[PDB]
Amino acid sequence: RFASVYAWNRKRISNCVADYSVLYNLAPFFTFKCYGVSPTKLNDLCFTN
Amino acid sequence: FSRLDKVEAEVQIDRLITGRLQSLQTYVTQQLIRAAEIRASANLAATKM
């Protein structure tokens, strides 16, 4: 179950490897929109937090 | 380049190419003006010699 929009959840993802490709193959989640990075680059970066 | 895609990254680079090339055009103009003032002094030094 998800949060109500005023009670919205927030979780630290840390000290792990993050893969977009395996999610997209899993995904009925048929949308995307990025704002400071290209979608085509998300698998090649690394992130602070 | 480690963050955007070629069809939208190039607008960020194009501003920087402009601004950096503009800064060289400032430097080369300022050097041409100072160099004319040093010449004016070299032709004076040559006249005193």
Q: Is A19 helix (H, G, I), strand (E, B) or coil?
A: coil
Shortest distance, CA B19 to any CA of chain A (angstroms): 21
Tokens of A49: 């937090």
Tokens of A32: 């995307």
The DSSP result for chain B, as a single string, is --SS-HHHHHHHHHHHHHHHHHHHHHHHHHHHHHHHHHHHHHHHHHHH-
CA B47 to chain centre: 32
Report which residue type is found at B40: A
Q: Is B13 on the interface with A (CB under 8 A)?
A: no
Tokens of A15: 């000290």
Chain A neighbors of B2, CB-CB under 8 A:
41, 44-45
User: Interior CA angle at A33 toward B11 and A28, to 5°?
Assistant: 145
Q: What is the separation, in whole angstroms, between the first and last Cα of chain B? A: 58
Q: Is B2 on the interface with A (CB under 8 A)?
A: yes
The H or E element spanning position A21 is helix A20-26
Backbone angles phi, psi at A26, to 5 degrees: -75, -20
Q: Find the CB nearest B5 among A36, A38, A45.
A: A38
Contact between A38 and B3 (Cβ < 8 Å) = yes
The resolution in angstroms reads 3.4
- Return the CA Rg of chain B: 20
Place of tokens 């402009």: B18
